Amino acid sequence: MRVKICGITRLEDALLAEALGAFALGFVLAPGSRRRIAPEAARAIGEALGPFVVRVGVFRDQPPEEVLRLMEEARLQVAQLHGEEPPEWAEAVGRFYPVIKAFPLEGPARPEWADYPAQALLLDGKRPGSGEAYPRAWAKPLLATGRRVILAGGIAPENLEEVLALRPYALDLASGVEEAPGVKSAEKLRALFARLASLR
Amino acid sequence: MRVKICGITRLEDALLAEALGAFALGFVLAPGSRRRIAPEAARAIGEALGPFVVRVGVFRDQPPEEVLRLMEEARLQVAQLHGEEPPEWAEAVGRFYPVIKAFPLEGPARPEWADYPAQALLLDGKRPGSGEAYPRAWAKPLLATGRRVILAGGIAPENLEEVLALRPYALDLASGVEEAPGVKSAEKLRALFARLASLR
């Protein structure tokens, strides 16, 4: 199963996540987040990573002119629009980078989202980065569309069997592997990736 | 273990490699190569892929400005320099994209290659694209340096043990999983990833 570790703020965490087998790493550049990091910093960390890990930039309600300039600034490869950006904007950025669109789940997901112009659709719980989970089924309607779906929302090594069952494109983790918001736990990560291979 | 499937020329091959768990896909843009693909085609195939797979451009003795133009046209994320590119060129391309530098092995690897300015050093056979293998121990001297090394040169699901034992950063495959140059074999691709999971 593909795993993305979001909210990276330290070299230490990026390297461990990479070593454990993460396919992608998230770098939050949305002013006002509990996991925000300076673009220049995210780039420094990127100079330290290997070429086979995707660098994702996370934004929120920022004009394409902004995002594209930030993406370049931090030398990122994929843009995650976590605000409520217009498909027009997603399209403008999607013209330079693959785009992942975030969508809150206050219940069932409107299959019409599979219509949003993004290479991946992320199903996150009520609040963004609030470690709040939700019932596994709430993803059915979107997964049904066949679009690549990334499951997030309080995922952790404990309740993997659930999300893993749905067999989505990838899993996105943050709180589930942190000792604190923005700080990762070597142990948590270790077990997580230990569980996965175990559930081969 | 991280795996890159190089020489992609068809969407079906890119999709299968992605589905099987490849971390990266190679798109050859070097004139004279048997697995060369049109940059507009690499872009099109790119639009069909998920965001968590790295798109690599492969070049040979092409100047920075050409490399950068191609990377942009094909919308690729990492540049693989497979010729005799001097460090100056690697640094120039590296201002914008992570860089992988290939070294054709004709004997034990030079530890001083660790000084070349690239995020990863790829060890290929005496004749790139030939599918010819080489004594794996030859990788020791460079692996010893601690830098990220990617092993290539006629790797196939049949000889995974030896290179897997070297614990490099990643493995690069092409001929080992093809029915013909540029045309991947579904059977071989599945065999490879099954053999890997079985040797975890």
Side-chain angles (χ1 to χ4, degrees):
Chain A
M1 181 54 81
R2 300 193 194 69
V3 177
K4 162 171 172 277
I5 299 300
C6 199
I8 299 297
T9 57
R10 307 182 311 169
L11 184 61
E12 164 191 355
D13 296 325
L15 295 178
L16 210 229
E18 182 185 46
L20 294 174
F23 279 74
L25 298 179
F27 294 93
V28 184
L29 308 178
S33 176
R34 293 195 312 174
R35 295 186 180 77
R36 198 209 150 128
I37 179 184
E40 302 95 343
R43 171 179 181 158
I45 286 184
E47 299 172 276
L49 302 174
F52 299 158
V53 63
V54 178
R55 299 167 179 55
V56 183
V58 187
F59 310 84
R60 171 164 292 211
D61 294 291
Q62 285 161 278
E65 51 201 62
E66 179 84 299
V67 174
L68 296 177
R69 199 175 195 65
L70 295 186
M71 286 292 306
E72 181 175 295
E73 223 172 298
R75 286 292 184 290
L76 302 172
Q77 300 163 328
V78 172
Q80 187 174 304
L81 304 181
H82 227 97
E84 195 51 290
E85 304 80 350
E88 294 54 279
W89 280 14
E91 286 286 299
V93 298
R95 215 135 298 177
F96 309 91
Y97 303 100
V99 171
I100 295 178
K101 189 64 187 62
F103 288 102
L105 288 182
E106 282 177 353
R110 286 59 173 292
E112 188 180 303
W113 284 329
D115 285 349
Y116 192 99
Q119 284 195 183
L121 311 175
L122 201 169
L123 298 172
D124 196 35
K126 204 296 180 180
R127 307 80 59 58
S130 62
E132 273 302 299
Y134 58 114
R136 289 292 90 87
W138 286 11
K140 266 66 182 301
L142 190 54
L143 289 176
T145 66
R147 295 288 258 68
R148 288 188 175 92
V149 169
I150 296 171
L151 297 180
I155 305 152
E158 292 88 60
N159 56 70
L160 292 178
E161 310 175 4
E162 306 181 6
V163 293
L164 191 61
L166 311 191
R167 288 205 297 82
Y169 170 67
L171 303 183
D172 187 82
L173 291 88
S175 293
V177 291
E178 301 184 311
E179 61 185 4
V183 184
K184 273 53 187 201
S185 164
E187 212 285 346
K188 283 191 172 184
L189 293 172
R190 221 85 184 189
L192 171 62
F193 283 102
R195 294 269 298 182
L196 297 182
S198 195
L199 323 183
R200 65 184 189 285
Chain B
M1 171 60 62
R2 304 189 195 62
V3 177
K4 163 171 170 274
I5 298 300
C6 200
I8 298 299
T9 66
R10 325 148 73 201
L11 175 65
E12 57 194 289
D13 296 331
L15 293 179
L16 212 228
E18 181 185 49
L20 294 173
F23 280 74
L25 298 178
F27 295 94
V28 183
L29 309 177
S33 168
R34 274 174 289 189
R35 310 181 176 65
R36 174 183 169 75
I37 180 179
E40 308 85 348
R43 179 176 183 173
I45 287 179
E47 315 171 69
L49 301 174
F52 300 160
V53 64
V54 179
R55 306 185 225 321
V56 184
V58 186
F59 309 85
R60 190 189 67 74
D61 290 338
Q62 296 158 270
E65 60 278 13
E66 197 186 324
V67 171
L68 295 169
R69 186 177 54 74
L70 293 170
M71 291 293 288
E72 164 70 336
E73 192 180 354
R75 286 292 184 289
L76 301 174
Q77 301 161 324
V78 172
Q80 185 174 306
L81 304 181
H82 225 101
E84 303 72 59
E85 299 84 358
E88 307 82 279
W89 285 19
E91 287 277 318
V93 176
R95 290 176 47 187
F96 304 102
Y97 303 100
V99 170
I100 294 176
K101 183 70 192 69
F103 298 79
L105 289 189
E106 195 165 287
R110 300 284 209 173
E112 48 264 52
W113 285 335
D115 299 319
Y116 191 99
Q119 282 85 316
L121 311 175
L122 180 161
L123 301 180
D124 205 344
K126 182 172 182 299
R127 302 170 55 241
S130 74
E132 293 185 2
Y134 57 77
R136 308 307 184 191
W138 283 9
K140 265 66 182 300
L142 191 55
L143 289 176
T145 66
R147 291 256 282 133
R148 291 188 176 91
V149 171
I150 296 173
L151 297 179
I155 296 184
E158 303 79 61
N159 52 32
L160 284 176
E161 294 62 61
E162 199 175 4
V163 302
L164 235 47
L166 297 177
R167 284 170 167 57
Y169 169 68
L171 304 184
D172 188 81
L173 290 90
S175 292
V177 291
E178 300 184 313
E179 130 181 352
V183 179
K184 304 298 177 294
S185 165
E187 202 291 302
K188 295 191 175 181
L189 274 174
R190 292 198 168 83
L192 169 73
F193 287 102
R195 192 73 199 299
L196 281 175
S198 165
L199 297 168
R200 258 304 308 173

